[PDB]
Design a protein around this ligand. Structure first.
Ligand SMILES: Nc1nc2c(ncn2[C@@H]2O[C@H](COP(=O)(O)OP(=O)(O)O)[C@@H](O)[C@H]2O)c(=O)[nH]1
Lengths: 420, 53
């Protein structure tokens, strides 16, 4: 009941999804053979647990990899709908040219996955924004299914481009297109960025050789913690919608920030105590989150915190109220108790307490200002446009897309100034 | 006519005896139902093994 269809997509989507299903198989005690030793898995003959998930890419590369690595037997081969021509970092190439040629089968399998459910609650996506395959295919799929399923909610665990050193040079174009699409037909654009992950792995775990495995494991932990207070017993339960309703005051204002706690090295593990005050110290610090927007250089329209662990309750609420009424400047004023909490009863594997802290803030306006600025600087010279027009598209969208982008921040800053 | 045995004097005994009999039969039926259910599950497992082979 209240199932979830996981939609992969793009190279980043495939890798993060592999890591996510790894973490879920760990938590629910599933070995990589497929047996046990309904919210996510589907039962199959002989007690087998096949993950309710779908992979996709215009290239069979990362699919081949995740089918070769660990936990490659779980996902059924009917859900590996994959083209062989590749997209190649061209959003139009993966949203207008090959979109119409593979989206048919993708919608077919997604329908056969959703109808196979009884009472679906929401969707949940993992993709990038610059890479053609990820951004294009994923946002086209979101468009189709949201124009198909109107009542259920969306979830985009989207990795935005890093600020300083990009991964692709034409990144801002695909980024602004995907953010003008997802702002219209998606309820949570939970943004993640790599450089903050690097700063974390150097500052709060001491791993001086940060490989993508550890970053993917961290975002996997956050993603799992997002919904853990649903598939477990809870002193005060939550879901994908209690968040979604305690979070967004206005449907456009739905671009969150993420944070996980606690994070410790091997040396620090022995000494650091695990009680809700230091968990709060961590979850409300700047260098602890996974976003390129200093939370101390903005405010919080709202912020929810899912706890995990058999701990007290009065102290949770007391520390929430203290953190609020202390930094009342760093929070917004016109809303009362802008901090929402929830508590489950089962901690993760390896700890005893855990906090997934998500927040609808207004600091990400810096990130969108940076992206819009790069867009202007790369567009006012028609640079790299002869690709995005050879694939059936006129510059109009871009401008209007960027136009919509402006309005977005034009609201954020506004609400950061109102006082009543 | 001073007293008429048509009134039930030992109603408590009737009630308690019927309660105990009903509990006994309910226990027997619960046991046989659990047995039937487990047998159905094991037959389904047998078909599973046949198909896997
Ligand atoms: N956190 C994280 N981000 C990744 C990873 N791999 C790729 N990304 C991002 O994924 C983006 C590429 O998007 P994608 O469409 O999948 O590449 P394409 O298939 O060649 O078009 C790049 O901007 C990368 O930065 C990863 O392993 N971890």
């Amino acid at each position: 009941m209240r199932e979830i269809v996981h939609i992969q997509g793009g190279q980043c989507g495939n890798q993060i999804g592999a890591k996510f299903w790894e973490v879920i198989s760990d938590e629910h005690g599933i070995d990589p053979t497929g047996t046990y030793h309904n919210v996510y898995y589907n039962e199959a003959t002989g007690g087998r647990y096949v993950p309710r998930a779908i992979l996709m890419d215009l290239e069979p590369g990362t699919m081949d990899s995740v089918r070769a690595g660990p936990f490659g037997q779980l996902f059924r081969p009917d859900n590996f709908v994959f083209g062989q021509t590749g997209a190649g970092n061209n959003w139009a190439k993966g949203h207008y040219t090959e979109g119409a040629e593979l989206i048919d089968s993708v919608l077919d399998v997604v329908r056969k996955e959703a109808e196979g459910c009884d009472c679906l609650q929401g969707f949940q996506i993992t993709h990038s924004l610059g890479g053609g395959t990820g951004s294009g295919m994923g946002t086209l799929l979101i468009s189709k299914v949201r124009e198909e399923y109107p009542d259920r909610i969306m979830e985009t665990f989207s990795v935005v481009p890093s600020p300083k050193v990009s991964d692709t040079v034409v990144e801002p174009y695909n980024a602004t297109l995907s953010v003008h699409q997802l702002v219209e037909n998606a309820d949570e654009c939970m943004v993640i960025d790599n450089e903050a992950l690097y700063d974390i792995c150097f500052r709060t775990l001491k791993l001086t050789t940060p490989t993508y495995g550890d970053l993917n494991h961290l975002v996997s932990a956050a993603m799992s913690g997002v919904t853990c207070c649903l598939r477990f017993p809870g002193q005060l339960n939550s879901d994908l919608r209690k968040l979604a309703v305690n979070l967004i005051p206005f449907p456009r204002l739905h671009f969150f920030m993420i944070g996980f706690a606690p994070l410790t090295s091997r040396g620090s593990q022995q000494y650091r105590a695990l009680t809700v005050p230091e968990l709060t110290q961590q979850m409300f610090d700047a260098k602890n989150m996974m976003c390129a927007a200093d939370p101390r250089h903005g405010r919080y329209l709202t912020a929810s915190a899912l706890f995990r662990g058999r701990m007290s309750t009065k102290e949770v609420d007391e520390q929430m109220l203290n953190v609020q009424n202390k930094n009342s400047s760093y929070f917004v004023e016109w809303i009362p108790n802008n901090i929402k909490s929830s508590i489950c009863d089962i901690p993760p594997k390896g700890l005893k307490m855990a906090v997934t802290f998500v927040g609808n803030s207004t600091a990400i306006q810096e990130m969108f200002k940076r992206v819009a600025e790069q867009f202007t600087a790369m567009f006012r010279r028609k640079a790299f446009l002869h690709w995005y027009t050879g694939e059936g598209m006129d510059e109009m969208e871009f401008t209007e897309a960027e136009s919509n982008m402006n309005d977005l921040v034009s609201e954020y800053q506004q609400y950061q100034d109102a006082t009543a | 006519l001073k007293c008429l045995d048509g009134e039930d004097l030992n109603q408590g005994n009737r009630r308690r005896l019927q309660q105990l009999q009903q509990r006994d039969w309910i226990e027997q039926q619960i046991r046989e139902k659990e047995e039937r259910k487990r047998q159905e599950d094991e037959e389904k497992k047998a078909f599973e093994q046949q198909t896997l082979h």
